[PDB]
Design brief:
This is part of a larger assembly, with seven protein chains of seven kinds. Chain B is of the alpha/beta class. Chain B has one domain: 3-Layer(aba) Sandwich (Glutaredoxin). Chain B has two helices and six strands, in the order E-E-H-E-E-E-H-E. A four-stranded mixed β-sheet of chain B has the order 3-2-4-5, with helices on one face. Chain B has a two-stranded parallel ribbon with strand order 1-6. In chain B, a hairpin with a 4-residue loop joins strand 4 and strand 5. Chain C is α+β, with helices and mostly antiparallel strands. Chain D has a single domain, classed as Ribosomal protein L22/L17 (Ribosomal Protein L22, Chain A, Alpha-Beta Complex), CATH 3.90.470.10. Chain D contains four helices and five strands. In chain D, a hairpin with a 2-residue loop joins strand 3 and strand 4. Chain E is mainly alpha-helical. Chain E contains five helices and three strands, in the order αβαααββα. Chain E starts with 13 loop residues before the first helix and ends with a helix. Classes of the chains: A alpha+beta, B alpha/beta, C alpha+beta, D alpha+beta, E mainly alpha, F alpha+beta, G alpha+beta. Chains in contact: A-C, A-D, A-F, B-D, C-D, C-E, C-F, C-G, D-F, E-F, E-G, F-G. At the E-G interface, helix 5 of E face helix 1 of G. Strand 7 of chain A pairs antiparallel with strand 2 of chain C. The complex binds magnesium ion (6 copies) and zinc ion. The site of zinc ion has 7 residues of chain F, from helix 2. Chain F: Belongs to the bacterial ribosomal protein bL32 family.
Chain lengths: ~240, ~150, ~300, ~170, ~150, ~110, ~130
């Protein structure tokens, strides 16, 4: 609910907090590359996909401007090495949610990412497996954001990745909810990684997970679910749309 | 108090003593301090007696640990799976000795009210009483007033 | 074919199971489906369920238990659906009660179920020596003072007609059948493997051929409770125990040229509508006469 | 104070090995500091034990007690939390496992009398607890038949022994 | 002992209960449907019913008139009695009134409450109970007995 | 009189856990053919009676609008109308009440 | 199983109600007028008057009280008692009751079937009278 009673309780006095809140991350993902609607059929052809990716990387002006600010700010930096570390950060992140070790899970993933992947899952059993990457990780684009307040530059490297994963979610009573551990399901993830620049500890992190518009509807859940109609008061009549 | 506790009938462990008697005590673990006065008696016992006691009884293992402990203790354990705890705390050599010999001769069975002194299987040799036993039968096995 | 009464049972049942797990072996792997609720009561209502697994009964459990005590039959589209009959495609569901304004669908289904019960009670109430060939379940309207079932019996058995003792035994075992609460289960078969179930009962196989004749796909509608399986037209009530007052009223022998066939007359009522004693008795008096509508 | 009951819903089990019986759902839910008395409360919470939750709400609804409404809301809450926060199909598949009242922390006041005597008065508060279990309501217990009692009697005559006999 | 007593004792005494019924009757005759305490309403019903048979005695009859004078507090109401209420009741001797029991009051005192009404008022129909329809399996089972009581006569 | 001895929790139990003191299960509970809510067999449905009550109230307001005094009440029978309706000859010559809502499901035209 | 409270009149439509009523009342008139004729049915042996005898009694309905006079001039009040329906119900032989006198069960005025209990209506349907108060 968005509610304020201004009739009595006044207005919370406007403060200058002695410490400006220090954020490791900015929540927003600035520019979302929207992948080609034919990326399922171009994924079976190796030198179609790999060629289009590498081509759109070299050709984009924004991409190489951002990789220029990253490179000029942070020496010993390479874009051909990155999808390796990125595909690693994944297999560490999910392997963390298995064991539920949240201390390493902070070192890896970003401020915006943690609340989501941790939240609704924290009372259940998570068992997830990494078997094949059918297409090796592809770097899609890079975006820099200039805060003229802080001089703080946030690099965000987008990695589009194809994967083979086995996920089993048990509910807190010990019974299975979502999907088998025996199906190494094929997944296409559009992933976003972020780094703070001015930071001396320069960590590379998982920022967000984006799903493209045409992306396949996910596995059918086990339990039946009821969507209620609107709750009616006594004098309110129902109305049915066509 | 009788109605307070459990009970057990009188019994043998694994029918011990019938075929061959088997000392039921398995192991003993002494824990004392080389330094503390509390263990004083139990130190002397460890010196002089333990050795010979061991020879007295092949069947039992004896684990003796000096450790920084303030209350000297001996723990009997039995083939019965039973365990008994003891303090040797501040006792003479004579005292300790007598106590270890107590442990030596026990069932391992628990000390509880023992309902009656005699365990007997089939006490009833030559018969066990039933009502009819002393009653004379009649001809035809008739009732008191039955006629034929 | 030398065969025991128990062996017949084991056969029909095991075949039925093979059929069931064949309907299951279509490999649906839990496809989601959707139902909307057209009922007067809870509008705008939606059930996302498991295709060919979830039932219109299991739909009522998202609403309340009230529906489950109350509802005998479910109208999906324009069709009566039995409560445990798993749904096929995405549809719209209404629920139906004994106390609703136009029960006639429900009423029919009740008479149906009722008859099927009695048929089973009859079959296993006769000596292993004699032969009971069960025939069919003639469908009368409700204003007919009873429900009916057709039975042919062994030729040396032809002379007798029952005593209220025997009838009362039928009734006793009927209630003993109500007591144990048995679900009514529905399977849909091709005639080819349906006929293999019945076999020895001739009139049965005939009825199967007729029924699968008027339906393009050779479709046979099979109903099962416990050990017993019968083919009938239309849906059945969800639970055995909905029936309260139950009876085998009279039996009346009737004979075609080619057969000697006894008709069983009986009368019964659900827990919900249950009749007072005097009333019950009067209905039990009208239930005595021959009631004939086969066409 | 003590809050224990609530935290029983945080307990996360080890996953089930296949082939084993699927463990039924369990939900602990309770309201604290109700203006009702402990005892009057008791009767209500005794009324609903064993029932299917819809049955429960049926009874609860029409009763005249103050507590009726309140227990009622707790049951609705419990139901919806059960299906939402834990995984349960079929929200009418529940029954009441355990339903009870504790006494809360009591306020203290004067109750005047006359001739200036005064009683000390207690403004009352109370807690309501319920644990809901998914499943069909456990079958109510029938009185023993004569066939039971006789069996007992005999079992006993045949438990007998001559005592002090050895 | 109450044996054969026809009146419940309400309010401060005899006279009090009468003025109580005065208000109730006034309200009934103005608003045509009222809800109130079950006993008070059940009681009132007799008075409501006979007032209408005074109304039926015409505007001219003196007894009837001062009767309605006393029994209707707002004097405005006396015409509605004779001109409106009494003429729309002709055919029916005693069937003036519907009294039904409403769910207990939602105040803390929780009384047993009813609603009382003049048939053929213009107001939303009270959601009365209906008998089961004649398609019900039971009634249907009785129509057989019915038609075979016709067919043997 | 003054109680001579504190009573036991046992004795207190058997007094106030006695079956006569217990709240009994009401078995006349049913559901509303209309709104599928609950009502005891012999009593009106609270909810349906509520739709009713509200409508009645609104009507009474709108007939307090057509009346310009505490004491002024018509000498004719009255009838109520809804959006898109007209007085019939049978019903003309009566006081009319013109309301905004469309004629509800349960309420009949009569 | 939560099995509901049921009386007779519950599910009867407006139509069947008076039908039930007429059906019952009619079978009542039939039932009473049938045994209206005792002596030709199967009358049990009539026995002579023995000196130590005890006659059967009756069941009545207290009507009112009324004054009535004697030829002598004194005044009385008397009770108006009305038999309405008096029909003997069952018979217990001498030894099955008191071991002394045999007992004769007797019924009172007639009432509604609807409000009595199964056991009883069964007993009456095996006799063929309507229910007694
Ligand atoms: Mg003073
Ligand atoms: Mg003083
Ligand atoms: Mg006190
Ligand atoms: Mg009285
Ligand atoms: Mg008073
Ligand atoms: Mg009265
Ligand atoms: Zn309603």
């Amino acid at each position: 609910f968005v509610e304020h009673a201004r009739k009595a309780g006044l207005v919370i006095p406007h403060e200058r907090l002695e410490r400006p809140i220090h954020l490791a991350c900015t929540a927003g993902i600035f520019d979302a590359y929207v992948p080609p609607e034919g990326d399922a059929r171009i994924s079976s052809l190796s030198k179609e996909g790999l060629a289009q990716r590498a081509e759109r990387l070299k050709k984009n002006v924004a991409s190489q401007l951002s990789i220029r600010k990253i490179r000029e700010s942070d020496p010993n930096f390479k874009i051909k090495d990155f999808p390796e570390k990125a595909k690693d950060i994944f297999i560490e992140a999910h392997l963390c949610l298995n064991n539920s070790d949240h201390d390493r899970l902070h070192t890896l993933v970003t401020e915006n990412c943690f609340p989501d992947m941790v939240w609704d899952i924290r009372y259940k059993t998570v068992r997830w497996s990494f078997v094949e990457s059918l297409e090796p990780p592809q770097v899609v684009q890079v975006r820099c954001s200039s805060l003229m307040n802080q001089g703080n530059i946030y690099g965000q490297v987008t990695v589009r990745m194809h994967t083979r994963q086995t996920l089993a979610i048990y509910d807190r009573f010990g019974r299975l909810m979502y999907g088998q551990e025996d199906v190494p399901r094929d997944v296409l993830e559009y992933v976003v990684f972020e780094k703070h620049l001015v930071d001396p500890y320069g960590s590379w992190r998982m920022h967000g997970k984006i799903i493209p518009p045409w992306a396949p509807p996910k596995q059918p859940i086990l339990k039946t679910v009821m969507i209620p109609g609107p709750q009616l008061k006594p004098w309110e009549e129902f109305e049915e749309p066509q | 108090t009788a109605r307070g506790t459990a009970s057990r009938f009188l019994t043998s462990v694994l029918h011990n003593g019938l075929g061959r008697y088997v000392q039921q005590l398995q192991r003993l673990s002494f824990s004392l301090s080389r330094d503390a006065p509390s263990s004083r008696g139990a130190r002397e016992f460890v010196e002089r007696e333990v050795t010979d006691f061991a020879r007295r009884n092949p069947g039992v293992v004896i684990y003796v640990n000096p450790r920084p402990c303030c209350v000297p203790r001996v723990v009997a354990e039995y083939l019965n799976g039973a365990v008994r705890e003891e303090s040797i705390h501040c006792k003479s050599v004579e005292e300790i000795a007598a106590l270890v010999q107590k442990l030596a001769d026990q069932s391992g069975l628990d000390v509880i009210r023992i309902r009656k002194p005699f365990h007997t299987d089939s006490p009833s040799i030559q018969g066990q009483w039933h009502p009819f036993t002393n009653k004379p039968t009649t001809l035809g096995g008739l009732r008191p007033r039955e006629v034929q | 074919s030398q065969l025991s009464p128990t062996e017949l049972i084991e056969m029909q049942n095991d075949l039925f199971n093979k059929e069931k797990n064949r309907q299951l072996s279509l490999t649906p792997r839990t496809e989601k489906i959707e139902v909307k609720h057209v009922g007067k009561t809870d509008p705008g209502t939606v059930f996302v369920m498991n295709k060919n697994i979830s039932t219109p009964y299991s739909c009522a459990m998202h609403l309340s238990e009230w529906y489950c005590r109350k509802s005998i039959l479910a109208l999906v589209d324009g069709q009566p659906w039995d409560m445990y009959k798993p749904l096929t495609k995405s549809c719209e569901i209404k629920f139906l009660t004994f106390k609703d304004d136009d029960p006639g669908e429900v009423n029919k289904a009740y008479w149906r179920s009722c008859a099927m019960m009695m048929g089973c009670v009859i079959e296993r109430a006769f000596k292993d020596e004699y032969v009971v060939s069960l025939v069919r379940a003639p469908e009368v309207p409700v204003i007919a003072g009873a429900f009916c079932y057709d039975v042919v019996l062994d030729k040396r058995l032809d002379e007798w007609m029952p005593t209220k003792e025997n009838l009362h035994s039928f009734t006793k075992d009927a209630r003993a059948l109500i007591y144990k609460d048995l679900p009514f289960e529905t399977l849909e078969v091709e005639a080819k493997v349906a006929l293999e179930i019945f076999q020895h009962n001739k009139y049965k196989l005939d009825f199967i051929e007729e029924k699968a004749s008027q339906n393009p796909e050779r479709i046979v509608k099979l109903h099962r409770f416990g050990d017993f399986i019968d083919v009938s037209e239309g849906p059945l009530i969800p639970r055995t125990s909905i029936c309260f007052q139950y009876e085998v009223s009279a039996v009346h022998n009737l004979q075609t040229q080619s057969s000697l066939v006894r008709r069983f007359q009986g009368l019964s009522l659900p827990v919900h509508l249950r009749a007072h004693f005097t009333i019950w008795n009067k209905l039990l008096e009208r239930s005595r006469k021959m009631v004939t509508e086969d066409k | 104070i003590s809050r224990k009951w609530e935290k029983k819903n945080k307990i996360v089990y080890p996953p089930q090995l296949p082939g084993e019986p699927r463990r039924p759902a369990e939900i602990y839910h309770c309201r604290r500091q109700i203006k009702y008395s402990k005892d009057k409360m008791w009767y209500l919470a005794k009324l609903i034990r064993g029932m299917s939750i819809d049955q429960a709400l049926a009874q609860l609804e029409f009763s005249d007690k103050k507590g009726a409404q309140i227990i009622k809301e707790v049951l609705l809450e419990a139901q919806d939390m059960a299906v939402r926060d834990h995984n349960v199909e079929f929200r009418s598949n529940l029954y009441v496992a355990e339903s009870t009242s504790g006494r809360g922390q009591y306020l203290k006041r004067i109750r005047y009398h006359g001739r200036g005597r005064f009683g000390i008065m207690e403004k009352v508060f109370c807690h309501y607890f319920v644990k809901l279990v998914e499943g069909p309501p456990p079958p109510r217990e029938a009185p023993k038949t004569a066939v039971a009692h006789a069996r007992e009697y005999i079992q006993e005559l045949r438990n007998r022994t001559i005592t002090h006999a050895l | 002992i109450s044996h054969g007593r026809v009146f419940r004792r309400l309010g401060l005494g005899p006279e009090s209960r009468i003025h109580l019924l005065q208000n109730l009757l006034t309200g009934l005759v103005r608003h045509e449907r009222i809800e109130a305490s079950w006993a008070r309403v059940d009681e009132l019903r007799g008075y409501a019913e006979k007032l209408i048979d005074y109304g039926k005695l015409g505007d001219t009859n003196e007894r009837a008139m001062r009767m309605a004078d006393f029994w209707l507090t707002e004097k405005d109401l006396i015409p509605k009695l004779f001109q409106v209420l009494a003429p729309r009741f002709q055919g029916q001797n005693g069937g003036y009134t519907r009294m039904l029991q409403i769910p207990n009051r939602n105040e803390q005192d929780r009384a047993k409450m009813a609603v009382i009404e003049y048939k053929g008022n213009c107001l939303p129909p009270l959601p009365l109970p209906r008998r089961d329809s004649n398609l019900t399996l039971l009634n249907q089972l009785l129509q057989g007995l019915r038609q075979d009581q016709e067919a043997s006569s | 009189a003054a109680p001579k001895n504190r009573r036991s929790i046992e004795v207190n139990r058997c007094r106030r856990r006695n079956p006569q003191k217990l709240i009994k299960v009401k078995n006349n509970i049913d559901v509303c053919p209309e709104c599928g809510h609950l009502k005891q067999k012999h009593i009106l449905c609270g909810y349906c009676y509520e739709k009713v009550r509200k409508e009645t109230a609104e009507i009474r307001r709108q007939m307090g609008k057509q009346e310009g005094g505490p004491f002024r009440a018509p000498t004719t029978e009255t009838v109520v109308l809804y959006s898109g309706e007209t007085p019939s000859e049978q019903d003309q010559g009566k006081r009319i009440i013109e309301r905004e809502r469309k004629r509800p499901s349960w309420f009949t035209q009569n | 199983h939560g099995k509901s409270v049921t009386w007779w009149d519950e599910h009867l439509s407006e139509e069947n109600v008076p039908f039930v009523k007429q059906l019952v009342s009619d079978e009542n008139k039939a039932q009473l007028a049938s045994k209206l004729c005792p002596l030709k049915d199967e009358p049990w042996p009539i026995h002579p008057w023995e000196p130590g005898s005890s006659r059967v009694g009756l069941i009545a309905l207290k009507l009112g009280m009324m004054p009535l006079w004697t030829k002598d001039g004194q005044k009385h009040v008397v009770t108006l008692l009305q038999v309405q329906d008096c029909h003997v119900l069952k018979y217990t032989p001498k030894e099955n009751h008191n071991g002394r006198m045999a007992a004769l069960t007797v019924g009172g005025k007639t009432v509604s079937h609807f409000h009595k209990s199964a056991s009883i209506l069964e007993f009456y349907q095996e006799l063929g009278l309507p229910p007694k108060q």
